[PDB]
Amino acid sequence: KEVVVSETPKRIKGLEFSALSAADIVAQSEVEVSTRDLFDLEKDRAPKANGALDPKMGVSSSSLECATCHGNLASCHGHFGHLKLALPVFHIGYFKATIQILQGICKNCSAILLSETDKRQFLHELRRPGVDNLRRMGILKKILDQCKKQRRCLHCGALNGVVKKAAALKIIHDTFRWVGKKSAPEKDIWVGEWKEVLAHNPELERYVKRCMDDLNPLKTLNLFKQIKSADCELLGIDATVPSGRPETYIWRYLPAPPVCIRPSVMMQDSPASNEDDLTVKLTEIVWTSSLIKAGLDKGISINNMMEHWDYLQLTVAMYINSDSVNPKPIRGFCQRLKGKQGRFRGNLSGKRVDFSGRTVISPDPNLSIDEVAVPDRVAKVLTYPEKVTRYNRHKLQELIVNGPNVHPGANYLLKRNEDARRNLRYGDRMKLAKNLQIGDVVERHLEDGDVVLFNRQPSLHRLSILSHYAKIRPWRTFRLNECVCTPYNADFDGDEMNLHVPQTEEARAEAINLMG
Amino acid sequence: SLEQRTLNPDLFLYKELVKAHLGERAASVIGMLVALGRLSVRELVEKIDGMDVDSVKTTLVSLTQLRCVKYLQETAISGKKTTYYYYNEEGIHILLYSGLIIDEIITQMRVNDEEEHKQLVAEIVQNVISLGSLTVEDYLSSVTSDSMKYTISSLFVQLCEMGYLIQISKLHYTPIEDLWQFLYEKHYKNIPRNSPLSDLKKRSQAKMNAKTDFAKIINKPNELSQILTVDPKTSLRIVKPTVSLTINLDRFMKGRRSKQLINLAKTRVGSVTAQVYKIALRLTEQKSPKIRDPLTQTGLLQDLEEAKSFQDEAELVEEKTPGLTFNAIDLARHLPSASLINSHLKILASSNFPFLNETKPGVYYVPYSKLMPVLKSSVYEYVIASTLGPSAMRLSRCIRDNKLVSEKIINSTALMKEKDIRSTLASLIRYNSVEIQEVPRTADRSASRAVFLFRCKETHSYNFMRQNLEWNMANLLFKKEKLKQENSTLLKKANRDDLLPSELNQLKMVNERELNVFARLSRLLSLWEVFQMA
Amino acid sequence: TEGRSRDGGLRLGEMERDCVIAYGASQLLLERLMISSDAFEVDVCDKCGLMGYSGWCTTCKSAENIIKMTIPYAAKLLFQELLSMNIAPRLRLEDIFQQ
Amino acid sequence: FPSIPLPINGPITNKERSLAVKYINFGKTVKDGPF
Amino acid sequence: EKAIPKDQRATTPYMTKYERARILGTRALQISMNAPVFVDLEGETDPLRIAMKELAEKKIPLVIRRYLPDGSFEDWSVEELIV
Amino acid sequence: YKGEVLGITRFGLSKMRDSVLQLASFEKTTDHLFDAAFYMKKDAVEGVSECIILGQTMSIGTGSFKVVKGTNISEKDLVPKRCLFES
Amino acid sequence: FILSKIADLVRIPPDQFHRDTISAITHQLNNKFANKIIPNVGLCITIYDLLTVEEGQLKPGDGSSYINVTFRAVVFKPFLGEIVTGWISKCTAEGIKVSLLGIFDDIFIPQNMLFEGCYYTPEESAWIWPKLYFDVNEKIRFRIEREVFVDVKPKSEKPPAYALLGSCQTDGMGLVSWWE
Amino acid sequence: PVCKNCHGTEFERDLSNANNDLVCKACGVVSEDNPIVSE
Amino acid sequence: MKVLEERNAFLSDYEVLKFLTDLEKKHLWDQKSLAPELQGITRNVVNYLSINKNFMSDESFAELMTKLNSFKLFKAEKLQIVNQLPANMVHLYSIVEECDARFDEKTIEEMLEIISGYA
Ligand SMILES: [Zn+2]
Ligand SMILES: [Zn+2]
Ligand SMILES: [Zn+2]
Ligand SMILES: [Zn+2]
């Protein structure tokens, strides 16, 4: 019940992007992957304890069950897990945009290296209603030099030089720009603070000018954490969202993807599973980040753990983008979204289509233009959905009783009540023929009158793909007329072309009147 | 509570102060000013959603009256006058300290006892600023006509001339940077063309004059020669009744810093000399040097040859001020013995904490600018020793005086076993009281062939400790009103009567438990405010 | 599946996608590239808009604001690969009608 | 779940139990006042 | 930005190449959803071929709503266009 | 049409038309997506190669106009049945 | 017995093109609204009339015609003090299960405005009276104070959709044949 | 394993026309369409 | 789903039987065909309220009510007393407040005569 349900159909007006927080990861996650090894030695069929291909993280085979949503392999949409790092590291994607917003702030009190009446002129060029991405990113080139051409801040006056890379993927702050006026307090502290270690082991005198202060991912996180909300608008980010802080641009938590993305493919070269390269990277993260957290608690040497936290910085910057290995190379995330037909060309722009076929061509004068001739062995595989109506009811009762062996018959049937389909080579057909509720859909064979596309495989121009009528002929090749071979520039010397058959009623009508 | 603990700066403090004791409609506007900086009403309505244009002005006049924002006007040559509105950081600290000024009138006005305005002088501070602004006619025209208020009106010149009741003006309700500009442009238009020589000094010729204007124009509220009326009838002296006045934060803040520093005495000496130091401390509070230093707020702090002068003359201000350098003679009459007056003060100079140390012979005084840097490092190291191990108190002092320690001299200078120093030092990289300094002895900064050096870095460790407490104040404030959301249906019944005999249990055990919160907040606020003496 | 021995299905590439849009045909382009190839029924939340499973959002756990739609499967798995590294593609929806 | 508390954990003293009364009636004035 | 009557009717009066590929496109799947035809069909099948016959006698019960690029309507009944 | 002759390279598209889903299908994919989520951009999808990835109806050709069914009715039978309001 | 001016869109499958426009919009709104509850309004019984009707749009992939339409339907909202002479067919040991027979039976109304000697007696009676009793399947007067509307689905019988608040505070409350 | 209409326990994978569906011989209702191969 | 006006107006209980009986009339001969879900609720409204009247013209329904609302402004209770225990004043005591101390004339016996008129 006695309660209504009602919702309009909706659309998508546009994508809009953001990096999500260090608190929205555990919001959408549901498991945790504390432990390391993927396979318990219980020697069961699905041994996965906590930190593995977990059965309530997803399901990676057809004989299992997803313990969260439910379903075997068609019902599971995939679910996220999360990790928890021991101490933070840098993001290899945002690595450029975590120094270009570190060249702007001070390095002691961490305020933007700008005066007060100057900055108000800058963000006045943001508030006007005509601003494009051509000029929005252009005017941030001027906000950054003006922070780099300004040596000392406002709130403590401490001198700030330049900060750049150190060419693994760590960055250092070149703090000393003296011309001849070396009588600065911080320079006097620098020679005063450093002279105490000259007493012991004075071999370090060839290491003076190369030594320089670091910015490790535990200083910068506790450096970004006190830059105020009021000046975010001048260095790229906006406020008013939760994840609008700059604290969320270096790894402190990282999510784990579902196993639908990274499925455990069974090669069946053995009774062992060929586990893909993406999980064994996600396990070498959780083993390095485990013994660090137990390392600082139990107590291990500081010169020892500083390379473990430098290994884990180098490992998380391989799980994303494997260009930074700096050497059979491991495939990563970024190593498959780009490339020649990795994504975006062979998966999203250009897909693989059902209901197609590819034989050789051979000439035929005796049929008309707009009729391609089709062999009958491919004419009783390529079906076409055909909804029952009172106009075509007396035909479609005569056709379902032919069966899928004589030519004008059907391959399947889907009633309005039924949910999946019904095959027609199994079970009695005449008892199924007589009922045929007027609302349902049969799938007849291809028959002469249908609307069939046709293209050459190297498609030079827009007249390389044309739409034809059909005619069912009893040989084994695609006959077509002589005059139509000029757009396809075919030559009948052994080459082959493929056909497409649309399967709506509004793309069956649009292929003729626009591509006939 | 991980949703709170991550993406919330000091904006989480300023949002829930106005959300606690004020309506919901103003917690959304001051949350937008801090998150965006400054913006006028013509684009404030574009940022928020759910508030009409004149409903913003109705919302904006609420925090106008309590001085929770600060305005500005700057016109254009082509356009009209635009009212840019900023955020007030000192007007809302009053709403933070608001329970403590009531107990600050009592601990500073001790001449009277068994008075019949104890219930009233506790209410006048609740009367002056919970109404917003205040003037003299607003309380004398009350429900009581006479009520011996000639005593009560003459009671307030005792309570205004001791401080923190300064007449308000456009100075306190404008910020500090938008005043300095147009006077610097006035002093630049005061000196014209027709002098080509040393034009960089001519640009600074206004700057030497604008300093003398700056300390002048901030004394205009402080100056007491125009705040009270000499009137030859029915009295002797009285404040001018046409004066719009509120409370002031500074002499409360200077009195709190003085209250903060007598507790260092009770540790470094017993309680005899701790009783001695209170008397000479409290008498210099009404004229002490400025804590917040409006000189150093915003301006020419960038260059050292000006930044030196922000404490060169300021120490000469403290040394050559007549009204605090006490003679060490008049202290005996204030204590309820010029030998014991000098002798119990002789131990102050002998202790290595420079209070009552540097002076002229015979006339002694407590310096400030070389003292409060030693208070801030003394309180912070005891917090580390209080909440975590005493081994960290040993290590943090060790790297302090020993500049740039390595891991071999740390076992020469201090004495602990090697396995235990990893389990204490690694708790100090996580919280930033130590740092790392690296020397690459090989090519391209390789980590296993490299040794590491340590440092104190005596600013980064105090910023993180400041904001480690600004969150914990506001997180305890988060469980203030959220506790009052459950059990709310009988808080209305407890506010509609001015009796189920079993329901009353569920009103006291929620009320005794929130009694702990205001005491826990006051102790943490004493732990926080030390880090404001910048 | 690519391969005649792997039971075929042929590749409508990117050279042949541009040949279709030159005709102006805008309904079999939608049919040949998600209906007969890659259809999948995603239910996505409206505010803080990102997809969830059968009836949940599992990031604002209220299970109230949900719209049934359908997109290609190869954009369901982009919106989780692009989400696995820290990029959040928030979806913003309108209704078709009432311009 | 987190350890290591601050040392400010005391049963409330009547020296400051009166101090906590001045807070709750301060906001009761302002909230029940104009705003 | 609203309905634009026959006085301010300033587009071409001709059924373009994309109209008759859409009107026939969206009429034809109505016939496969048991919608009633208007024309005297003979013994005949294939709801597309009964849809392009119905366009010859101009008995489509539809109307084309042309949007200008400035957010303006424009309506044209499908009998009114000639091809 | 934007003020300067500009090529069809990487250097030529980042000043011609900026929209992140379309630029991902060109050469350098991920370098346009990370700085997209940094600035927290917003692209409304109306391009040809952006309504392919989402499975929505293209805006050019035979998708430009929209089709409406007439309601063949007027106000002559849309009167209410209101009677005996209050007496 | 009051109207409620609401707005909605309604779909029409293309086999309903022979039936004219107002006869079909009435049908496809009936099975959407008949014996239904509205979130936070009430129970629409049957659509009263049509206020204005717009022109039918087409989703391009669908082929049907979708019309947005504003109308009012008749819905009962008695009063916050309305007398209602319902019946009963259920009794329990903590209140009284007074439900109007025929229309809805999702109502539990208490007796919290009566005297000090009320409990439950499990001998066909409500309680012992200090007085002709009342039983099921006869006209029983009961009025209304309040109602509670929630629309919650906490996924992981007491139907919480439409529950009224009733009392029997004065005399004659429990049976209509006690008076007249 | 079990049909929704006849509840048989024997299924026959039909590969006669390259569909590779899964269906019983009792009634003829397909149990799973579009197989997901282990690539 | 936008509710424009929740309580647009009032409608009397007679049109809940009057327009609904004309819906019963063009409903393929209800109640006498003895020899979906929308018609059971439609049937359960007609038999409920008409029995309450039984156990008629609308012009006579109007003349009694215009005399019934002799109130100054608080009238709207004149519409609810159409089938709520007719021909009794001890039920009219419990309907509307503060009318035991306001109506002490032959009005309360004239409202007895109106409520006994149609009953
Ligand atoms: Zn699941
Ligand atoms: Zn600084
Ligand atoms: Zn959501
Ligand atoms: Zn079966």
Task: Characterise this structure.
- This is part of a larger assembly, with 9 protein chains of 8 kinds.
- Chain A is built from 13 helices and 19 strands.
- By secondary structure, chain A is of the alpha+beta class.
- In chain A, the strands form 5 sheets. Chain A has a 6-stranded mixed beta sheet. In chain A, strands 12-15-13-14 form a 4-stranded antiparallel beta sheet, with helices on one face.
- In chain A, strand 13 and strand 14 form a beta hairpin.
- Chain A is elongated, with a radius of gyration of 34 Å.
- Chain C has 99 residues and is of the alpha+beta class.
- A 3-stranded antiparallel beta sheet of chain C has the order 4-3-5, with no helix packed on it.
- Chain C is globular and about 45 Å long.
- By secondary structure, chain E is an alpha+beta fold.
- Chain E has one domain: RNA polymerase subunit, RPB6/omega (Eukaryotic RPB6 RNA polymerase subunit), CATH 3.90.940.10.
- Chain E is 22% helix and 8% strand.
- Chain E contains 2 helices and 2 strands.
- A two-stranded antiparallel sheet of chain E has the order 1-2.
- The longest helix of chain E is centred in the first third of the chain and has 12 residues.
- Chain H starts with 11 loop residues before the first strand and ends in a 7-residue tail after the last strand.
- Helix content of chain H is 0%, strand content 23%.
- By secondary structure, chain H is an all-beta fold.
- In chain H, a hairpin with a 6-residue loop joins strand 1 and strand 2.
- In chain H, strands 1-2-3 form a 3-stranded antiparallel beta sheet, with no helix packed on it.
- The radius of gyration of chain H is 10 Å and the shape is globular.
- Chain H contains no helices and 3 strands.
- The interface between C and F is medium-sized, with 20 and 17 residues.
- The site of one zinc ion has 5 residues of chain A, from loops.
Output the keywords.
part of a larger assembly, 9 chains, A: 516 residues, 4-stranded antiparallel beta sheet, I: 119 residues, mainly alpha, 47% helix, 3% strand, globular, binds zinc ion, transcription, tfiiib
Strand ordering within the main sheet of chain C: 4-3-5
Q: Residue share in helices of chain C?
A: 25-40%
Which overall shape of chain C is indicated by the principal axes computed on the Cα atoms?
globular
Strand content of chain C: 15-25%
Radius of gyration of chain A: 34 Å
Query: Can you summarize the main beta sheet of chain C?
Result: 3 strands, antiparallel
- The structural class of chain A is alpha+beta
Shape of chain A: elongated
Strand composition percent of chain A: 5-15%
